[PDB]
Design a protein around this ligand. Structure first.
Ligand SMILES: Cc1n[nH]c2ncc(C(=O)N3CCC[C@H]3c3ccc(Cl)cc3)cc12
Lengths: 336, 267
């Protein structure tokens, strides 16, 4: 390697530790890696930034996908990659995003925790922006492939107050509460329909503060399927005609009898959680949570649902100017 | 699987990596002290064939090979041949391309064995000594490649628009094999840095029609496209086949490689 080329680049290369203060500012740990709430050292602005140190050294498959896709994608409801740092000493990759104080996991947890002692307008506005973000991705042939409350961010106080940001574009290809039944019966490819089922599960959870297909923690998963049928009922032959083509169908026939779920339907489940089966919300929910993936509503069709024309209309700030009661992110002082 | 299909006009490919011809020629002048314009083009044809061979060995799809070829071209579009060894850059580009295209992470043993084997079995005329690099060198080079491309990893190619055009002609069986093959050959040139891939496809399809003596003038007339730009591309393709005729890669490349500018070593 040419020496002058090498030192020229070493001189000019911006290093993450010189540009950003983030020591002791870790807000999350997971398979994604390490996320920090960071500020600029050369204080041109006073904005909060999210800095993610990716899992492992070098460029993983997961990291390649997120970097590749977020470099291209631009939409108000998809998180924006601001910068990439490549640290040559330790071979660590850093990704810079704008900082989201909240997400659906924590918003949902706040309301579920209150049940020992969500506004409906916020529920509609959240759903609309999720669909809008996912429609944009689907229009560009990008599947998220693991949508859940934990990776649907919501901006806190600032110029983007209450704006949804879909995050985590690293799913390159445990609990299965958001996984569509075709995956559980051995579907070989990810699809757009699979993302829409997940949005269905998320919407049910926004309405009840409860994970609809909650289950105790080889694509065939008996207990997860059992929970889905206890909520939805067991699918009729005409409801899902291509179920026979699924690799795990004989196992399903072996382990399950339709008669076990005779009194089970989404109507009766949602009736227990005080959601009206006559509501436009319920009818939209039911179309998202259709068992046969080819009979599932698309993102664009869901966005055109009369639910979103009904009062109250979805707002761009999901909190609608009202005071944010959800706490700020705590810093993690755990060793590991 | 079809990620970012239809987004070209809003893409980093279009916005950052469709370069100006005179700018590209200006940055090339530092290497043109050491090599002629002819020798530089021959050298780029050579490394296109090296990347092709590497990808065939690793049993990769053509899109992965195409993407790795573009990565390589973009690097030396901006930097000198002395900056990093193209013998090292070629497998590094293939390595990064297979990740980006979701083919997989090629293993340490498989990638180095592929580079060693291909250069021994297929390019002994150009390379007397064995592949000197190890996996630590590939990973180091991957950081430089990623930095220089400004993390622009999604690349568009003429194959998808070409397939769409021949299906729209209803002439898939007759025209596709030759047109596809002419698209492969355009990677011997700078065309991928200078033109939208759909225009490269139409020029390759046009040359295939002329070769096979198929009348398609009405179909081409009905297109909404600047035909002077297509004719510019056609001239480069015809010029490519004349250089091909007059170029013996096997007889010439050892001497051309010896003439490449060498890296400055450390103190
Ligand atoms: C926080 C925050 N703000 N802006 C962001 N952009 C991207 C990401 C992120 O990479 N991910 C990956 C997994 C789901 C999300 C995330 C969310 C919350 C936390 Cl504690 C850690 C990580 C986080 C933030």
């Amino acid at each position: 390697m040419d020496y002058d080329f090498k030192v020229k680049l070493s001189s000019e290369r911006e290093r993450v530790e010189d540009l950003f203060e983030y020591e002791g500012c870790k807000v999350g740990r997971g398979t994604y890696g390490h996320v920090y709430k960071a500020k600029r050292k050369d204080g041109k602005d006073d904005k909060d930034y999210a800095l993610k140190q990716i899992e492992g050294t070098g460029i993983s498959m997961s990291a390649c996908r997120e970097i590749a896709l977020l470099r291209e994608l631009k939409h108000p409801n998809v998180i924006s990659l601001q910068k990439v740092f490549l640290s040559h000493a330790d071979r660590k990759v850093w990704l810079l995003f704008d900082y989201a104080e909240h997400d659906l996991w924590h918003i949902i947890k706040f309301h579920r925790a209150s049940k020992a002692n969500l506004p409906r307008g916020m529920v509609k506005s959240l759903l609309y922006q999720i669909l809008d973000g996912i429609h944009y991705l689907h229009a560009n042939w990008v599947l998220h492939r693991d949508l859940k409350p934990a990776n649907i961010l919501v901006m806190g106080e600032g110029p983007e107050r209450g704006r949804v940001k879909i995050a985590d574009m690293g799913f390159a290809r445990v609990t299965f509460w958001y996984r569509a039944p075709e995956l559980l019966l051995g579907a070989r490819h990810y699809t757009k329909a699979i993302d829409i089922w997940a949005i269905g599960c998320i919407f049910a959870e926004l309405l009840t503060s409860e994970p609809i297909f909650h289950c105790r923690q080889n694509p065939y998963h008996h207990d997860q399927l059992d929970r889905i049928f206890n909520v939805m009922g067991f699918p009729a032959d005409k409801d899902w005609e291509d179920i026979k083509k699924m690799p795990e169908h004989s196992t399903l026939m072996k382990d399950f009898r339709r008669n076990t779920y005779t009194n089970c339907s989404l109507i009766k489940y949602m009736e227990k959680h005080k959601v009206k089966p006559d509501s436009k919300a319920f009818h939209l929910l039911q179309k998202l949570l259709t068992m046969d993936p080819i009979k599932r509503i698309t993102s664009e069709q869901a966005m055109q649902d009369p639910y979103f024309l009904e009062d109250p209309l979805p707002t761009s700030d999901v909190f609608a100017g009202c005071q944010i009661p959800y706490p700020k992110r705590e810093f993690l002082t755990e060793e590991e | 699987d079809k990620a970012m299909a239809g987004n070209f006009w809003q893409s980093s490919h279009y916005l950052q990596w469709i370069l100006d011809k005179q700018d590209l020629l200006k940055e090339r002048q530092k290497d043109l002290k050491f090599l002629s314009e002819e020798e530089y083009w021959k050298l780029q044809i050579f490394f296109t064939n090296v990347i092709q061979a590497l990808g065939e060995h690793l049993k990769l799809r053509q899109q992965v090979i195409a993407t790795a070829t573009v990565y390589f071209k973009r690097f030396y579009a901006r930097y000198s041949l002395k900056s990093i060894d193209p013998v090292l850059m070629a497998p590094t580009c293939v390595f990064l391309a297979s990740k980006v295209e979701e083919f997989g992470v090629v293993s340490n043993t498989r990638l180095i064995a592929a580079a060693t084997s291909v250069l021994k079995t297929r390019f002994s005329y150009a390379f007397p000594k064995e592949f000197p690099y190890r996996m630590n060198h590939i990973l180091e080079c991957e950081f430089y490649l990623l930095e220089l491309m400004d993390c622009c990893l999604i690349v568009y190619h003429p194959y998808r628009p070409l397939l769409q055009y021949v299906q729209d002609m209803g002439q898939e069986d007759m025209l596709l094999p030759l047109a596809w093959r002419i698209v492969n050959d355009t990677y011997r040139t700078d065309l991928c840095l200078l033109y939208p891939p759909f225009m490269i496809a139409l020029a390759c399809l046009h040359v295939a029609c002329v070769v096979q003596q198929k009348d398609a003038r009405q179909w081409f007339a009905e297109l909404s496209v600047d035909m002077e730009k297509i004719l510019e591309i056609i001239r480069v393709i015809l010029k490519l086949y004349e250089q091909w005729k007059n170029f013996d890669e096997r007889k010439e490349m050892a001497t051309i490689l010896s003439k490449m500018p060498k890296p400055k070593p450390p103190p």
